[PDB]
Amino acid sequence: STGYLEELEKERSLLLADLDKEEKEKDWYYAQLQNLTKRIDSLPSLQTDMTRRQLEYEARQIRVAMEEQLGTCQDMEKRAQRRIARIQQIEKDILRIRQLLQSQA
């Protein structure tokens, strides 16, 4: 409720919000990629070729912006591990600190 305990509960809320944001950030980037993919699969020629390369290029830009934003696929998955690990470590700390304050009271 107060002090370090308050701070831990707020760090936990922060980390939980990090996971949620990053995951919606990924759904966003992937929805974009999937739609460009479905578009390449809707093509019938010189025109179709012109268009397929344009879309692949565009999908190439969307992949670059994403890695610059969420890192690679390797560090994107390890980032969520430390968050989950930390949230879980924070949760046991909180219980013990409440128990400590209870012990006294």
Side-chain angles (χ1 to χ4, degrees), residues 16-31:
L16 281 170
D18 298 320
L19 290 174
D20 192 54
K21 174 180 166 175
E22 184 150 301
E23 262 43 70
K24 290 175 175 171
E25 200 167 8
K26 270 180 53 178
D27 289 336
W28 182 51
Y29 282 121
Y30 287 167

Side-chain angles (χ1 to χ4, degrees), residues 37-75:
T37 275
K38 287 167 56 185
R39 283 224 289 158
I40 277 180
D41 306 358
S42 305
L43 298 171
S45 75
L46 169 53
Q47 153 65 317
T48 291
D49 272 23
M50 294 283 76
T51 296
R52 175 177 297 100
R53 290 165 200 132
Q54 180 48 46
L55 300 180
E56 296 184 313
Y57 160 77
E58 284 177 40
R60 200 168 287 137
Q61 301 319 300
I62 295 176
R63 225 109 91 269
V64 173
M66 179 174 199
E67 181 164 296
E68 282 175 340
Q69 280 287 70
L70 307 163
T72 69
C73 187
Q74 273 50 51
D75 56 359

